[PDB]
Design a protein around this ligand. Structure first.
Ligand SMILES: COc1cccc2[nH]c(C(=O)N[C@@H](CC(C)C)C(=O)N[C@@H](C[C@@H]3CCNC3=O)C(=O)COP(=O)(O)O)cc12
Lengths: 300, 299
């Protein structure tokens, strides 16, 4: 009973713009008087292989950037200021966005989930939820012209913006910026080829998923045997597994099932070996794309 | 290959709480009409078998109160109530200023649509389902989600295709088309209901296999071929839907040079087992991705 859920995209659609510098164009996020977009917008296609953004910046001026609002309330958008921030450009416009929602800037830790709004030419086209892999990449769907799309969560009315798209790596694997400018996984926003670290299973999400299995009757894998957290984080470091860090959302699951964290840590150790042709909520491989928060809100 | 819905801000602009005595759920506000599941008239007790025909005439000028909570808040005075199928078609003295260009098309099994789940007239989450061959959906609805809406978008035209109404034994859901008719003809009544046995969306597996080939996973292709007509006869006995090709499945055939009928035969083999192999990271066949999905996302 567990489906990939995203926040309703509206609030964010009200903030998407197109940013242009010469002929290069991408997506931006118009919050109040500021417009954020990736800095590789300044760089001509020729210098993309080794750009000199400190050069490009000083070489640029407000007349280099044109911002346009293609959706909903149309907009006369004029830049009056610019700064670069890590891999992020911080343009200043003269009209505050009236549809600016309550927002903050938190950097996601691995394993956590967030919604992302897939935009092209400052026009939203699709929404989908991802999880921040331990190798600090994401398995989204992103095409030509999608940079500057945004990733956001939402507690209450506050949108926590967390991700701006930037690049694609090997096949299908993507990464980007936190809004403090820093690229996740210390990747370089250049057209060079770059190698990713190895992807690990987020152990906490596996735990949640097993909990959701218990909640839907699929419990055959629950044995009395228990492996500690301290012991688990040790076996974990040598089997492509993340340190298990327990949270109160996990304790809540542990009570309504009466099955302890350490019971499901020990099963994880057996099930990575092989299901031996068995299913848990329809799958043969451990699921790590669902958070304990997810399982709580969804199977509540 | 990710599960992807449309943006929802358009649909979010139309959501609305409808309240009728003790009962409350979501509606959709387009022009001067608010749509909603008709069981709001039934008091909570008497749902085991209501007389919606009785309940409707018992209604008066002020039986329904209607609130908009997002954007410009508002109570709306209703000026006329008509029924239609399992839905209440309510008439309101203010046309929705954020009304989009829309149609009401019934969805057929195998096709994907976006859902916007609401509780008390408030959008909370959005996802994408496929309509199961047995006319249920595998979704995530809780208490008060009644009235949430499923849609597709063809250009900038919202195609409303679903209003959620109920949950069967374990979390398989259904609702109505906007013509009023329940998918699967389940009854908007509080009784246990048998869902037919599901099947495999043959076309969506052919799409998914084409998604593999595109990503370099071609090991399962062999020059053998099963004809569509052969397949469907076979499908009847093996829990599959009949295959109906498409301009979109044809695009995959071209940019892969792999015939539909090769993957039809390839389906018949893989239905047994993968023989210790994996396809895009999976052991069983995957049927929730459409030929349109594969076309858009590997393009
Ligand atoms: C009667 O013996 C049964 C046996 C076995 C299964 C059964 N299922 C239902 C049922 O589903 N009943 C509908 C109302 C009837 C009249 C059609 C309902 O309740 N629908 C929800 C949506 C549901 C809530 C849970 N997830 C959803 O999607 C509304 O949105 C309101 O929500 P709430 O009443 O406040 O929970 C009755 C029943």
């Amino acid at each position: 009973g567990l489906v990939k859920m995203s926040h309703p995209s509206g609030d964010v659609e009200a903030c998407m713009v197109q940013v242009t510098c010469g002929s290069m164009t991408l997506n931006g996020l118009w919050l109040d008087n500021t417009v954020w977009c990736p800095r590789h917008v300044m760089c001509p296609a020729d210098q993309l292989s080794d750009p000199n953004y400190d050069a490009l910046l000083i070489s640029m001026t407000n007349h280099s950037f044109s911002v346009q609002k293609h959706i909903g309330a149309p907009a006369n958008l004029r830049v009056v200021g610019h700064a670069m921030q890590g891999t992020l450009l911080k343009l200043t416009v003269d009209v505050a966005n009236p549809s600016t929602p309550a927002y903050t800037f938190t950097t996601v830790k691995p394993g956590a989930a967030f919604s992302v709004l897939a935009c092209y030419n400052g026009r939203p086209t699709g929404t989908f939820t991802v999880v921040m892999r331990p190798n600090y990449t994401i398995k989204g769907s992103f095409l030509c012209g999608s940079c500057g799309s945004v990733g956001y969560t939402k507690e209450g009315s506050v949108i926590n913006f967390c991700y701006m798209h930037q690049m694609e790596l090997a096949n299908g694997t993507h990464t980007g910026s936190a809004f403090d400018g820093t690229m996740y996984g210390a990747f370089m926003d250049k057209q060079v080829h770059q190698v990713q670290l190895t992807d690990k299973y987020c152990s906490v999400n596996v735990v949640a998923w097993l909990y959701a299995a218990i909640l839907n009757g699929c419990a055959w894998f629950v044995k009395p045997n228990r492996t500690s957290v301290v012991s688990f984080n040790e076996w974990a470091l040598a089997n492509q597994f993340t340190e298990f860090v327990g949270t109160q959302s996990v304790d809540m699951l542990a009570v309504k099932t009466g099955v302890a964290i350490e019971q499901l840590l020990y099963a994880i150790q057996q099930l990575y070996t092989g299901f031996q042709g068995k299913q848990i909520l329809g799958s043969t491989m451990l699921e790590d794309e669902f958070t304990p928060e997810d399982v709580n809100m969804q199977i509540m």
